[PDB]
């Protein structure tokens, strides 16, 4: 099973063929770190970690599974809130902050007991957004509910129809108003393949 | 920019072929059975600092 964080924290803090062979898989650990960066509406994220006995390499070992209409609704709420923020309020952050001579910051002394700031969350009016209010900004929403998610591996989902109405209403900014495929006429993949095979250019199409 | 992004999409649609059948692939399951690796639960920022200092 798992292990407390203080041990691996001491591992990384106090610090060769067993040390040499584990260093081969470094960009794989970089990929597993980069594919699980937390969302703007999350404050903290707790993930599992595989690590070597001497702290040679540290892995993430988690696939970022999300439910698709919930994910689109959450990013549409982000879009609305950031439009709201630029029409209301800009100072860009100064890039690379940590200078070339100082080491990276220690987590046990500076970030560990400091409470983070307020994240990006919409108001979520309790009259209309009532079926979505208790789970909209969770890490993995509705995970421990047997009605909606099949289990802990978080693979299959089924929802109710007012919930789908609410998630379609909140995601209205990211979705087009199309109703049929009488749109995309001579602007679809088969016409693009025909223009590829005949070496011509559709007006607005690619070359 | 629209026309070039649509060019990349048409190229990815045309060059698509079905993937070849193979055995299911699990790197971390073979890493877990090794006694040289341990599992824990950490914050994202702490492991993000650990990965970059190990790379340094």
């Amino acid at each position: 099973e798992d292990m407390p964080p203080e041990h691996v924290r001491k591992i990384i803090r106090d610090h060769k063929r067993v040390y040499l062979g584990a260093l081969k898989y470094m960009p794989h650990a970089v990929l597993k770190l980069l594919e699980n960066m937390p969302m703007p509406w999350e404050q903290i994220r707790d993930v599992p970690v595989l690590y070597h006995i001497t702290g040679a390499i540290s892995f993430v070992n988690e696939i970022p599974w999300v439910i698709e209409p919930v994910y689109i609704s959450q990013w549409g709420s982000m879009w609305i809130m950031m439009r709201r923020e630029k029409r209301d309020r800009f100072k860009r952050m100064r890039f690379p902050p940590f200078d070339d001579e100082e080491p990276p910051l220690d987590y046990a002394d500076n970030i560990l007991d400091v409470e983070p700031l307020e994240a990006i969350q919409l108001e979520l009016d309790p009259e209309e957004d009532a079926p979505v209010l208790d789970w909209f900004y969770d890490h993995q929403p509705l995970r421990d509910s047997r009605k909606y998610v099949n289990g802990s591996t978080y693979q299959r989902w089924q929802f109710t129809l007012p919930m789908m109405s609410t998630l379609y209403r909140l995601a209205n900014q990211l979705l087009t108003d199309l109703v049929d495929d009488n749109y995309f006429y001579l602007f679809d993949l088969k016409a693009f393949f025909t223009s590829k095979a005949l070496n011509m250019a559709i007006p607005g199409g690619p070359k | 920019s629209y026309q070039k992004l649509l060019k990349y999409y048409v190229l990815n649609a045309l060059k698509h072929r079905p993937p070849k059948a193979q055995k299911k692939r699990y790197l971390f399951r073979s890493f877990k059975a090794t006694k040289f690796f341990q599992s824990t639960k950490l914050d994202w920022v702490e492991v993000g600092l650990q990965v970059c200092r190990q790379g340094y």
């Binding site: 063929r17 062979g21 | 073979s30 090794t34």
Partner: peptide
């Protein structure tokens, strides 16, 4: 000697996914 044998066994196990088709 043991650690290199363990990582070589894991390399052979990662090579097992395509072993009978590639060689």
């Amino acid at each position: 000697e043991e650690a290199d044998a363990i990582y070589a066994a894991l390399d052979k196990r990662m090579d097992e996914r395509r072993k009978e088709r590639r060689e």
